[PDB]
Design a protein around this ligand. Structure first.
Ligand SMILES: [Ca+2]
Ligand SMILES: [Ca+2]
Ligand SMILES: [Ca+2]
Ligand SMILES: [Ca+2]
Ligand SMILES: [Ca+2]
Ligand SMILES: [Ca+2]
Ligand SMILES: [Ca+2]
Ligand SMILES: [Ca+2]
Ligand SMILES: [Ca+2]
Ligand SMILES: [Ca+2]
Ligand SMILES: [Ca+2]
Ligand SMILES: [Ca+2]
Ligand SMILES: [Cl-]
Lengths: 367, 368, 367, 368
């Protein structure tokens, strides 16, 4: 029985900062986890340091599901969504990494097999609310040349205190990207919560005219009713879930009318949680298309899960500035011929440059 | 890594025949699975032999989920409910046994650990449609004495071509068993599809009056709309799912109104599928209380899954003539202090007597 | 009172293998049944041999409905869907054949009359996922010339472990078949479960643009909710049911939102069951358009039932390689001027070459 | 006009630690807010210090609603349920205190006036899962004697990893407390998420038999569909909302079937947010009965809002160990003749002992 000796919560400067969890077992082997670095992930890290670490230390790696579910019911009044679920997700991923090393198996081999070990990417391109038409086109062309993606998603990342800011301008941007990519290109559009119901419908119809494949988070994530209503009113596939943090809330998103869900493995659930979400998606007949923006640990957890997904429909997300995986990681997310290559090393198979890490890492400690 | 060398479909005389799948890996290690022995499980074993074995042999043990999902989609036009899903469940269990033996762990330790390793049981007591009141009472007394269960479920096992056969008699039986067990005892009533909607409600109300805790399969299982309607109209917890064989059908059962679901690990899914069922149950806030009537391989697969269920609300089912686990098995289901004790042997932890097995087993092969 | 002397379960090499049931009455007259030959129908045949045959032997032909309903409640834990319902369907059809011969009447004469004895066919053309555009066109033209059908259906028969494989390619194939057939041609599109909800909607709209009449099984058959949702969201008629095996499940398909149902007479119900399905369809106001892929016994059972259908809307299915009806059958499904001619011989009116049968038949027996 | 000079996040030892926000304006006036002290409120205070303070400092006190709505949308990917919403609630309360001090008015007089300035209380009595029957009874007797409340609520505070733990025992406890208090007493039962759907119904019916007035959080809060289903299936008023942290989630809770909602002013919204919640409650015709367990700042914010509620149907919650309000506060929650007396001091009207505070307080700063 392999025991957890130590749990460390680490804020790490990259390439912006990331939030990692390093769990050292009693035998000296090491597991890596990642929490969504929202405002640096500092809050999630504190929670790991103050609440999760003292509980997990002395306990057994293979009890990971029971340990973390119990931890979540202990942290439930912390939300738990967002900060607590990222903290838990991070620890889940670190324990799976440790589990894979203890058992001598890559994670997908512990999960019942991969349908594929080469997974198509899609270029996820943010910051388009602030760009001119021509800057949007330039950035798309620049990333498409470098990544050879199977699809492209243009995200707005606008100011969520404002609604329906520039509908004609957003449509003009989507038009110009369609003209750039040609008529057969698979294109997604991420509104980042930019629209009212009426505004989302107006944009969706224009996206339908331009042949777009999906329409991501058209309304505020807290209007679940409206999200599903827009989903059911439009032909273009409305997608949401990256700001959904529980299995039950995911269930409710589906019931609202969403047919493509996107929970994130470092925002919630970790490997265990995400496998549960995939089963729920398959039970209801909805597409499962995870949100993932981190080039190292999160990406590896993401692709282990996705290799197990039978009815994979869209490609793996490749977000902006993935080059920031270096130099902390030696093998971070990097597409070859438009695909991610999943290897067979035990655990995650993430390779960490330990001396670069330490020079860039700051431990978050009880306080 | 490790390859599947050989898959055998085995009809085995017990104690009535059971239907087992033995999978041998290329290093000679052996995994055991079981299909629900409906009409002997012969049809399911046939499907294992003709369709599943030739595909599985030469493949990777650890690829169990991909392999069996692929196999289900090849076998889809066989139903696949019942025969086919039981056949895939048997293989899934066998591969998990192997997986656990290869990896050096009990199944529950591959599933993230256990909430408990001592699981309370309930006495599942059938054939009460054909019994008189005193015979019902005598049998409940007998088994409660032997098993000290946490709950009792009396099942009817009536003739499904007939409806609303003896409502007053059924009620008097429920009443007699309440008098016997006392005001505090947890009692369930399994109609085994015996009632119409109206008959179900009438009986349900009478069960509520007697403090019964759940009401199992009040109507024909194929009336999913009615099953959920009855569940939402009553106070007593209506349960169903033993004759539900896919994840999606489980979701439909839940959407219809059912709040206690009972899929069976040797009828569908095996370990992989049941863990997905458990997750769907947890997503929708419904009780997960599996059906299980086999004392050996099926029982063991069942308790591994149930050890990992956080919000277990009802005990482990312990069905009639569980004594038949011997002599084929050396450690089959056996309650001590009203509990099943989960152990930590690699894989299932089930121990087979090869000698007894060889003398009891008929291989189902291609061309029988 | 005519008694059942013998029930035989027969695996038969055709023209692939079929699964027949031969019931011999005590007077020596013979009835023929067919079970859907899924993986040869071997499993259904075993079930007939082990479970159904010993029960039916010694019993009376005219008790067919009571006998088989009782048999289904005895076999219910076998599913009963798929394997058991095909086994039961086969025996139902053989008993109706025997019933028609005993009474001296064609089956449609026992069912209350035919609206027509000449029934239009439609060419049902599979294997289009694996073909190039040009091979799809070639095969359609080849079959349309030979069959003079009232409609054409192109089926994909793709790999159900994969979802949304080639949407632009499938649409290109549907376009080219529309161009080949002209603007007035009645064309159906069988997705064989190839799409997600979003994918099915995308394809359906393109099929709507190309004037297609129906859209068959767009999503996995086990996503009944999604099937009906797509049905209600689209203008093109979504159809399903060939993978529905009970009256109650059919009822649920209808409630989900499907408005065209396609149960198969050798997969389920037989003549008795299908007559019940037709009544349910008529009660709910949905089209009844049975799936049928077998050129002999199944086809004859199908057309007896369909001659009774008042509001027939689509033609009779004529699937690939119907020529395999010969030489076991002397009068198998063969269109003349685009129509099937239903004759007045008692029972099914199927004519069996008994010596070809025996040379090609293998009995499945208790074991 | 008046600017925010400084925001401090304070962890304060009471009587168990509370989590307070002190906002000082540029004229040296001071406003007090409180975040729900979940696991000490340390995470919420961290968020105040790192994320909210640098933004608020230099801004206008009277811009509270715009400022905190803007702040919530910047902090949205922290949840924001729980930690973040409690942190924004604390700031909202502090700014209202300041607003009231600046304007020379009590908060309720800025909110349009009060229906009443004497508010009845109810005794909220926790930890009854772990108690024996006699211990439950003794504690209800003790507090009812000391507090003379208008109602009593007995809460369970059970282990949320466990479900349907002791239904008969729970019922016997409810029964014993009814015998103690008499036929007329208003009694609520707080399951603290202890039951499945079926277990909730079973308990609900038993509570209806005993004339209980409401049934609080029968199921896991994350099962919103089940919570509403249970609410619509029972007669006894099912209440929830204490673990609901946004306005929209409150609306979903109401749509699910719940007709009594209980958001908490120091968990979410603060004064601004709660008044919006009250309005949504009034739009949908549901009871508005906030959760509140803190004796000082939170209590005061709570009674200001509740003074303005036209159709108040249930009393003000008075939770365990309210005595811990002293010595940090000079006038914390204290029932007289079963009532809380709302006064007319500018702002909250809460009086802090700076001396005790300084000796009890740890500032949570950037880099601790
Ligand atoms: Ca241990
Ligand atoms: Ca430590
Ligand atoms: Ca996004
Ligand atoms: Ca072999
Ligand atoms: Ca049962
Ligand atoms: Ca042995
Ligand atoms: Ca007779
Ligand atoms: Ca015979
Ligand atoms: Ca078809
Ligand atoms: Ca400052
Ligand atoms: Ca409470
Ligand atoms: Ca003072
Ligand atoms: Cl009622």
């Amino acid at each position: 029985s392999l025991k957890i000796a130590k749990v460390e919560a680490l804020s790490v400067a990259m390439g912006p900062t990331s939030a990692f969890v390093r769990i050292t077992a009693e035998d000296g082997t090491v597991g890596w986890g990642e929490a969504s670095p929202m405002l640096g992930g500092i809050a999630s890290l504190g929670v790991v340091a103050r609440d999760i670490a003292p509980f997990l230390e002395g306990q057994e790696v293979l009890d990971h599901a029971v340990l973390l579910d119990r931890m979540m019911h202990r942290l439930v009044k912390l939300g738990p969504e967002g900060i607590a679920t990222a903290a838990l997700a991070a620890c889940d991923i670190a324990l799976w990494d440790l589990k894979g090393k203890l058992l001598g198996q890559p994670i997908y081999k512990l999960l019942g097999g991969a349908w594929r070990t080469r997974l198509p990417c899609y270029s996820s391109i943010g910051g388009n609310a602030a760009r001119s038409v021509d800057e949007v086109v330039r950035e798309v062309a620049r990333r498409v040349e470098a990544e050879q993606p199977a699809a492209v998603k243009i995200r707005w990342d606008g100011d969520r205190t404002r609604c329906d800011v520039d509908i004609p301008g957003d449509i003009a941007k989507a038009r110009a990207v369609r003209e750039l990519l040609g008529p057969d290109a698979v294109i997604g559009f991420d509104a980042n919560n930019g629209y009212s119901v009426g505004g989302a419908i107006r944009v969706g119809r224009a996206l339908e005219d331009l042949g777009y494949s999906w329409f991501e988070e058209p309304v505020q994530h807290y209007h679940v009713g409206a999200m599903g209503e827009v989903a059911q009113r439009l032909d273009i596939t409305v997608s949401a879930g990256e700001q959904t943090y529980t299995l039950q809330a995911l269930k409710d998103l589906i019931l609202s009318g969403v047919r493509m869900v996107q929970p994130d493995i470092v925002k919630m659930g970790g490997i265990t949680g995400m496998m549960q979400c995939a089963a729920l998606a398959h039970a209801h007949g909805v597409e499962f298309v995870p949100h993932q923006t981190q080039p190292g640990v999160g990406h590896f957890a993401n692709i282990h899960v996705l290799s197990t997904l039978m009815h994979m429909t869209k490609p793996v997300e490749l977000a902006d500035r993935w080059d920031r995986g270096r130099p902390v990681f030696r093998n971070p997310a990097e597409p070859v011929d438009g695909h991610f290559a999943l290897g067979d090393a035990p655990g995650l198979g993430i390779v960490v440059d330990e001396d670069e890490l330490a020079s860039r890492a700051t431990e978050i400690t009880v306080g």
